[PDB]
């Protein structure tokens, strides 16, 4: 839809993820089954979001200089972008499951896998500066 809101929506999605990752990382440092489930409840909500309508063509850093970090490359690799998007949704399910199993070791392992997916996509599609 109107870029102004697509940007608005996608910024909220990532600030949300970023926050969750930061919180789960501290929890993994000092595992507590209860706080992991509260964090897992929040992450589950976030992943219900469809990122598909979030990257309509014409919203890259080259189209909206300084308003987004979305690399125009996304629009030449939408299939790979979707895959990295799906890969993330799956690692997160693993994290949620581990939290709910109360498995501090499983949860720590799943978190690494998840962080790996953030980096994989950012690596090819987000701009440093
Ligand atoms: C993994 C759970 C994951 C996290 C964590 C995450 C964080 C994140 C932040 C906080 C930003 C903010 C911008 C900044 O650099 O300050 C950001 C932005 C983008 N991301 Fe991301 N992100 C995670 C995962 C992924 C995945 C799976 C993808 C690609 C399929 C992805 C892509 C991007 C893109 C593109 C942006 C830029 C969006 C914009 O600036 O408008 N991220 N992410």
From Swiss-Prot:
Keyword Iron: yes
Xref: Pfam families: Cytochrom_C_2
Post-translational modification: Binds 1 heme c group covalently per subunit.
One record GO biological process: electron transport chain
Keyword annotations: Electron transport, Heme, Iron, Metal-binding, Transport
Binding site for heme c: 10, 15, 68-69, 118, 121-122
InterPro entries, sorted: Cyt_c/b562, Cyt_c_II, Cyt_c_prime, Cyt_c_prime_subgr
A GO CC term attached to the entry: periplasmic space
Gene3D superfamilies linked to this entry: Cytochrome c/b562
Gene Ontology molecular function: any one: heme binding
Job description of the protein: Cytochrome c' is the most widely occurring bacterial c-type cytochrome. Cytochromes c' are high-spin proteins and the heme has no sixth ligand. Their exact function is not known.
Protein name as catalogued: Cytochrome c'
Species name: Rhodobacter capsulatus
């Amino acid at each position: 839809a109107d870029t102004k809101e697509v940007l608005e929506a996608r910024e909220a999605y990532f600030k949300s993820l970023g926050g969750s990752m930061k919180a789960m990382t501290g929890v993994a440092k000092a595992f507590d089954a209860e706080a992991a489930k509260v964090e897992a409840a929040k992450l589950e909500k976030i992943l219900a979001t469809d990122v598909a309508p979030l990257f309509p063509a014409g919203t890259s850093s080259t189209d909206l200089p300084g308003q987004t970090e979305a690399k125009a490359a996304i629009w030449a690799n939408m299939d790979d972008f979707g895959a990295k998007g799906k890969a993330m949704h799956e690692a997160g399910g693993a994290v949620i499951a581990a939290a709910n199993a109360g498995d501090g070791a499983a949860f720590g392992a799943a978190l690494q896998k998840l962080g790996g997916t953030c980096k994989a996509c950012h690596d090819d599609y987000r701009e440093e500066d």
